[PDB]
Structures are given as structure tokens and as C-alpha cells.
């Protein structure tokens, strides 16, 4: 027995994704290709974020990713930032930023 | 029980940063992230089908839903990956 995620060449649970669609009352019926396409999209966006969050992890010389990094990754990326523009990452701080009209003098 | 995308989030982590770990709190955020997007995409998918008097969702919807939800480049890559996972998935046995 081979799993669909294997057939689709994915890390994400194609079966699970599929199970959630039907038990989510999104439609009467669910095509076989939907969960596959979807699982991929979720895996891909997940990779995209760990990727950048990981980078933030090394930037601060740390091997373990924590919320801060995830915040820094998302906000420092114009597209991920827009995607999650109305989401709040608990324990994620804010990007360092001080309005210029407010610093020093000469 | 309480399912979560945790293990898959983790498996993908090692694919990108094999030497980077992830705190539990962070894992919890990634799960909220996956559940969120899932819902948004599924929701849009759902609407599209309803608009067009259709009973089945079906990778067409998931795709148009991605185009409608994901920003620029992020959506470009998303659509291929999906179109790829469905082809690879189909060309098998």
C-alpha cells in the first residue's frame, strides 16, 4: 500500500486534507484532485515560511525557530506580510522601526 | 485525540533547514497558519462552486481560489506546485 502523498510526491497528508474538505461542508462532492492540489499548496507555503523564518534564526545566531523569527520572516516579506496582514502571531514582536523625524540631531 | 500538521510542518522544516529546530510555541503558530490558509482556500473554493451551481469542488476551484487569495509571486509558485502535485499524482498507478 502506497499513500497518496507519495503518489503526489508530497510531505503533507493528502488523505487528511481530503478528509477535512468533505467533513467541512464546503461542497456536496469532492474531486480526487482537490485535496492533492490543496495539500501541495499548504506544504509549499509552509516551506516558504520556515525557509525565511529559518534565515531569521541564523541572522540572530540561533538554531531553533521561535515566534519572533516567524514574525520577522512574515513582516519582512511584502507578500507573506500581505497574506497575513490581518493575522497576529502571538509572542511575535514588531519590526525595529523608528520614524526618522524622531532621531538625533547633527 | 488532537490532530495537527505538526509532524508534516517538521518534515518540511528539515527539508529546508536540516539543522534548525523549532520551539513548540512556534510549531503551534505554524499549525494555526496551516489551518488558517486551509480554511481560506477551502472557503473560496466552496463559494466559487456555489456561484457556478456546482456540486463538486475539484482542483479547478482550489486553483482559482489560490489565484484569488495568494499575493503575486507567492501565488505563481503555489499554482505550479499544485498543478505539479496533481499531475505527478495522476501519472502513476
Amino acid at each position: 500500500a502506497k499513500t497518496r502523498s507519495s503518489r503526489a510526491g508530497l510531505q503533507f497528508p493528502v488523505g487528511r486534507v481530503h478528509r477535512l474538505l468533505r467533513k467541512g461542508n464546503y461542497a456536496e462532492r469532492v474531486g480526487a484532485g482537490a485535496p492533492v492540489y490543496l495539500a501541495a499548496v499548504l506544504e509549499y507555503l509552509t516551506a516558504e515560511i520556515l525557509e525565511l523564518a529559518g534565515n531569521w534564526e541564523r541572522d540572530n545566531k540561533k538554531t531553533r525557530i521561535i515566534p519572533r523569527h516567524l514574525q520577522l520572516a512574515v513582516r519582512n516579506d511584502e507578500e507573506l506580510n500581505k497574506l497575513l496582514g490581518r493575522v497576529t502571531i502571538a509572542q511575535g514582536g514588531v519590526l525595529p522601526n523608528i520614524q526618522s523625524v524622531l532621531l538625533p540631531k547633527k | 485525540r488532537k490532530e495537527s500538521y505538526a509532524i508534516y510542518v517538521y518534515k518540511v522544516l528539515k527539508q529546508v533547514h536540516p539543522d534548525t529546530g523549532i520551539s513548540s510555541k512556534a510549531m503551534s503558530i505554524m499549525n494555526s497558519f496551516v489551518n488558517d490558509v486551509f480554511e481560506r482556500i477551502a472557503g473560496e473554493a466552496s463559494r466559487l462552486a456555489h456561484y457556478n451551481k456546482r456540486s463538486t469542488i475539484t482542483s479547478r476551484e482550489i486553483q482559482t481560489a489560490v489565484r484569488l487569495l495568494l499575493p503575486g509571486e507567492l501565488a505563481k509558485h503555489a499554482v505550479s506546485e499544485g498543478t505539479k502535485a496533481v499531475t505527478k499524482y495522476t501519472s502513476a498507478k
Binding site: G9, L10, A47, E51 | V12, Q15, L74, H77, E81, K84
Partner: peptide
């Protein structure tokens, strides 16, 4: 070989 990230990197491996 997996997915292509915007940065150019990919999952490579399964």
C-alpha cells in the same frame, strides 16, 4: 525533487 521556493531553493530529496 520537491518544490521551488521564491528564493530559488527547493525541497530536493523526496
Amino acid at each position: 525533487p520537491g518544490m521551488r521556493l521564491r528564493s530559488g531553493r527547493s525541497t530536493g530529496a523526496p
